[PDB]
Amino acid sequence: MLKYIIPTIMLMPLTWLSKNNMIWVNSTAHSLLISFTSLLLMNQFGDNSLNFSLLFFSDSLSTPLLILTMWLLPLMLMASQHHLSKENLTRKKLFITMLISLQLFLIMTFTAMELILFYILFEATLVPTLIIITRWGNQTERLNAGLYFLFYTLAGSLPLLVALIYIQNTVGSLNFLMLQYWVQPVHNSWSNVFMWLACMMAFMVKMPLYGLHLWLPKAHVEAPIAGSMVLAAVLLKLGGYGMLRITLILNPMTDFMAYPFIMLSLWGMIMTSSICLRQTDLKSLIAYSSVSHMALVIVAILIQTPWSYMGATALMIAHGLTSSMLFCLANSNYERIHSRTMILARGLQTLLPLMATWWLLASLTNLALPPTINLIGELFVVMSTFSWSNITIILMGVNMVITALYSLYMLIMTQRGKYTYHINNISPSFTRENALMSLHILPLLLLTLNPKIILGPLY
Amino acid sequence: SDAPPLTLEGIKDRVLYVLKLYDKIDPEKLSVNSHFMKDLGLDSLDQVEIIMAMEDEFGFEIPDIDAEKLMCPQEIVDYIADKKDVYE
Amino acid sequence: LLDLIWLEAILPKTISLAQMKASTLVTNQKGLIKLYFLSFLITILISMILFNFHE
Amino acid sequence: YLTHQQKVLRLYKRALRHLESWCIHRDKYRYFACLLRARFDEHKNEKDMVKATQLLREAEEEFWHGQHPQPYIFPESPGGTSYERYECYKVPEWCLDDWHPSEKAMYPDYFAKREQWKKLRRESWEREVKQLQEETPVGGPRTEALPPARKQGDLPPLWWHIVTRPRERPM
Amino acid sequence: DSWDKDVYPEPPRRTPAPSPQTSLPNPITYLTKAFDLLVDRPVTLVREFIERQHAKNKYYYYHREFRRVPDITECQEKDVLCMFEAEMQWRRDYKVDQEIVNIIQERLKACQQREGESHRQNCAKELEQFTQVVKAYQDRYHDLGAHYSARKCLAKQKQRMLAERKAAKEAAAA
Amino acid sequence: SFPKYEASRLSSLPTTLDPAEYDISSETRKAQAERLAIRSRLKREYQLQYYDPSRRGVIEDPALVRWTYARSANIYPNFRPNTKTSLLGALFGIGPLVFWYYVFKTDRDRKEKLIQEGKLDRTFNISY
Amino acid sequence: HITKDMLPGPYPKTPEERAAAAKKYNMRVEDY
Amino acid sequence: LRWQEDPEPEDENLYEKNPDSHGYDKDPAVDIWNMRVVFFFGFSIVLVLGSTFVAYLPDYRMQEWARREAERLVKYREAHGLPIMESNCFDPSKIQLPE
Amino acid sequence: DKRFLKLLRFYILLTGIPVAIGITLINVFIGEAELAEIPEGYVPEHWEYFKHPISRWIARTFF
Amino acid sequence: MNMFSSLSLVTLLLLTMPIMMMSFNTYKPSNYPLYVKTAISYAFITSMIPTMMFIH
Ligand SMILES: [Zn+2]
């Protein structure tokens, strides 16, 4: 993985050694080259995963997450070019370094072969993220959102460290390849109930699990646009990725320990999806949509069926491109009216004809319009859960109806109707904004032509 | 929508054309400025019907808050021409 | 009721509130030598009489 | 609020319109329209408040019982089929300020006149604001009405958004 | 020439002969002539030219053959260098057997459409294989979970064998 | 024969059948005059900048800000764990989760018993 | 700019608190 | 006042000084170049060539190789009269059952 | 909006038309491979197990 | 069959030409409504050749 780690590190010298007015051009250009070279990770074989060295490997679960992670970095730079223009030059470079540092940790997290190297990097994506939220927000609430984002994650991660070290003392190693052949059944005892609850709690806070999710409406709302994109597109999938791996060594106890989380997720789907129906804040409405979408990911992972795992991987990738697009769309309005209230600017389809098309496509992907990969993943999780228990079709069905209501309500409320009279500063959509959306939606729809590359190792 | 554009002459003619078909107004003492209460001698209840006939004539509704404030053959022409965007 | 009140009231707020109360007890001190050293005597007696650390 | 005279005038127009819904045909509507006016003229002269209010309030109850479940609504009136059918084309005029110059040159005459109106609006603003500071009571306005222009060279206060508004059939 | 005709059996064709009992012209025949002259001809000429360019440069690709290796019933506990060999083998078989079922499904689906209304009786042979291969697949590759492995498949097989060897005693001991 | 118009929360009382609209005193008329005074004092403040020709941007609406602040930021400081909230929260919050838990455990327990006895049809079930 | 006094607050108990709220919301002390 | 602070600056529209702006930078010379790199590398290198690269990947997870192998076995199984698929995945002669 | 769409079309086709032409020529004048039995006593290279020319090129150069 | 198969899909493809051409700005405006109408006309005829072959 050194062919991706070093180039990511070399963006920092590039930003700090470039002309004062070429920081965005140079960083954006070379970060796009790293994405182009990230396609070399699709050398996956049908039996054995790509094992680069003693530290790093890349199977089909982490390959699309590496491709997605490296592809958002150029998009975060495009999105951040407006609100940072009237900022000190040295501070603009530091902002870009935080994004690059965040990528450097993410591409090593998804590739770590040991579970402790994974933990260190998985837990290292908190300093660059927390600093972005707190230092480059806009509201007074960014500071309080940083504390929630920080102490929800650490309160779950620290037991995971104790649990992983305990497993190393007993099994002998934490290398993921070794654990596959040295895995042993987890006997039913009160000690193993709390080993299970420490190996899964750190990941379920970041998914997030319903109840342990109050940090998402804060962090994803108060953060800058670049922070929102990475938070809702790559950082919620750290818990999903870790769970897909840590459930290897938690059998058969996962058969009965999964009920309280399947029930929180299934019922948390309807509650979170229903909150969106009554949100006054456009950005907050999108934030809760991630809690409702990631609820299926938890259910799919826990029930542990080949169809569920295929759906979870597709859902995570599909949700990554859709949530980022919606935040970018919501940010275009904000940079014009400087308000997150959803009922302040209306009828924007009459003033921004093309931007209203991007809203439609993002909304159609959000509500799982077939054959988009947002539907392939969601469809698979529904098929898997129906075999789990036929009654789950009811809860999944209700979620679809509520999902369509809040996705179109967001579109109708902001785009259709009569334009607000006193809003007279709706500049024509920039090429930067249009190109930013085209970089989200075009890859998302192209994946419908070749969906096999996002279905994970169970394909 | 494949319909004739209203004209200031046309609106005035039809408004007079209607009031000249009401069996309480003299068709030879009616000018474009004849007040419906003092220069013609009609009550408010007869003024409500006049507005209705005009509103049925032009196929749109005049609000009550504005119907009761229009008492002249010209106030019905400057009003309709204002709503239908007629300037010549 | 369930996202702005109670899910906040059980885990974050109550935990945060208790730490503030605990912090006041530990730091609300009068700075007198007579009282600090009087506690050292309590610890020594409690160590020997209650926990038997001297055996 | 609405004076007792106004209430009867509304209840008369509204009663006729719902009657027109039932009758449909003009001859049938006319026959029952004159009878309906008969029930108003007979009590039109009584000038006792209790009798006037009692008659009106009782008239309302009869209307609400005899009203048409699906009354006729003019196409562009509130609730009609064609209501707000053209609000998707009423682009505000300030949008023209952001046109690229390459497309402002297709209409050199129109945008030339638009500069006259924009200049005619900057000049007359400070005067209009002053006029409202001298015709206004101490605390603040107590009615929803604006004054006219009292001198040559002055346009009516607060005229731009009532004059430059989008047309009823923009396209 | 093309796909092997033994994997995908094809019942022999039986085309009824034309028996026109009407003096009117048949629209299909005249349309068929036009299609074979304005569509089938230029398409054939273009394909022949393209096929000729291949003949000049001919190269071959081969089918990878995986040497059989010891299975998971021969690896000592916690011997990774032997389990790894066995696990990869079991994974390739899991993939191949996933395709055998697909081939049998294609046979069954083709029969139903080919037989038209008379599919219930004349597609029993394919339906009989589909019931047996599916049972075989369901025995060896079902209920293993998302974290499947040769060890879990062996554990299921032995549990099935024990019950077979158990109920046989009572069932057979008459 | 004119039955009274009974109103519900989803069917408001018509303004022409409401007694308050036909028993009007001097005090009510005075009150309606100052409702129109505020409605007219706020209108001008919006108009003094709506019509301003040097203004480009968004006219801040404090009523809108308070509405959004009341819905999001001003709920917890006004929350008291009284009897109503505790019962509603436990019912809405914990109720459904416990309900669904036994709906699925019973369904899965019933299904597991059959699959271990052979009387559950899984002939063609090879996708799970 | 909106300050603390221009934002919703706790339930008003004393009549003076009621008047302060009503004035803040552009209502009449009676309607509020 | 309660302190000495600057006034809330007005947002600067980028279509006033440069009515051909792409929205990237306030300098027209660099504004175009930022647009070219995003469009060329973004659309002409990753979306076009990346899609072409993904389309022609070597057999991805041997899903096409599995087909060829299955066709062989079904042919060999049926040619020599053997079951298409045996219900036992491991030979029940290298397995030592308990008891 | 029109200018952006024109730029999007220009840059999509900037490397799309050469690829559409390039892929057409490779298929027409090089064609795909023909499956054949592995000659006895011969070890094919890892990129000779792939049919399409571009699939083989990807395997030989990068993978 | 050769004629039945090709003409059944051409009906579907013909209806997607107006969308595809309009995407890459390869048409003439103010004639699009008549362009779409004509495409439906020819799609209708091509759908009758499979229909007659079925009726036969
Ligand atoms: Zn701004």
From Swiss-Prot, chain E:
The keyword Iron does not apply. Residues 1-13 have a biased composition (Basic and acidic residues). Residues 1-25 are annotated as: Disordered. GO terms for cellular component: mitochondrial inner membrane; mitochondrion; respiratory chain complex I. Pfam families: NDUFB10. Transmembrane segments: none annotated. Keywords: Electron transport, Membrane, Mitochondrion, Mitochondrion inner membrane, Phosphoprotein, Respiratory chain, Transport. It is a peripheral membrane protein. The modification Phosphoserine is found at residue 149. Belongs to the complex I NDUFB10 subunit family. Complex I is composed of 45 different subunits. Interacts with CHCHD4. This is NADH dehydrogenase [ubiquinone] 1 beta subcomplex subunit 10. It comes from Bos taurus (Bovine). The lineage of its organism: Eukaryota, Metazoa, Chordata, Craniata, Vertebrata.
UniProtKB/Swiss-Prot annotation, chain G:
Disulfide bonds: none annotated. This is NADH dehydrogenase [ubiquinone] 1 beta subcomplex subunit 8, mitochondrial. The chain holds residues 31 to 62 of 186 of the full protein. It is found in: Mitochondrion inner membrane. It comes from Bos taurus (Bovine). Complex I is composed of 45 different subunits. Belongs to the complex I NDUFB8 subunit family. Accessory subunit of the mitochondrial membrane respiratory chain NADH dehydrogenase (Complex I), that is believed not to be involved in catalysis. Complex I functions in the transfer of electrons from NADH to the respiratory chain. The immediate electron acceptor for the enzyme is believed to be ubiquinone.
Swiss-Prot record, chain H:
It is a single-pass membrane protein. It comes from Bos taurus (Bovine). This is NADH dehydrogenase [ubiquinone] 1 beta subcomplex subunit 11, mitochondrial. It is found in: Mitochondrion inner membrane. The chain holds residues 53 to 151 of 154 of the full protein. Residues 14-25 have a biased composition (Basic and acidic residues). Complex I is composed of 45 different subunits. Interacts with BCAP31. Its main location: mitochondrion. Belongs to the complex I NDUFB11 subunit family. Keywords: Electron transport, Membrane, Mitochondrion, Mitochondrion inner membrane, Respiratory chain, Transit peptide, Transmembrane, Transmembrane helix, Transport. The keyword Electron transport applies. Residues 1-25 are annotated as: Disordered. GO terms for cellular component: mitochondrial inner membrane; mitochondrion; respiratory chain complex I. Accessory subunit of the mitochondrial membrane respiratory chain NADH dehydrogenase (Complex I), that is believed not to be involved in catalysis. Complex I functions in the transfer of electrons from NADH to the respiratory chain. The immediate electron acceptor for the enzyme is believed to be ubiquinone. The chain crosses the membrane at residues 37-57.
Curated annotation (Swiss-Prot), chain J:
The modification N-formylmethionine is found at residue 1. The chain crosses the membrane at residues 4-24, 43-56. It is found in: Mitochondrion inner membrane. Core subunit of respiratory chain NADH dehydrogenase (Complex I) which is composed of 45 different subunits. Core subunit of the mitochondrial membrane respiratory chain NADH dehydrogenase (Complex I) which catalyzes electron transfer from NADH through the respiratory chain, using ubiquinone as an electron acceptor. Essential for the catalytic activity and assembly of complex I. Belongs to the complex I subunit 5 family. This is NADH-ubiquinone oxidoreductase chain 5. It comes from Bos taurus (Bovine). The lineage of its organism: Eukaryota, Metazoa, Chordata, Craniata, Vertebrata. The chain holds residues 1 to 56 of 606 of the full protein.
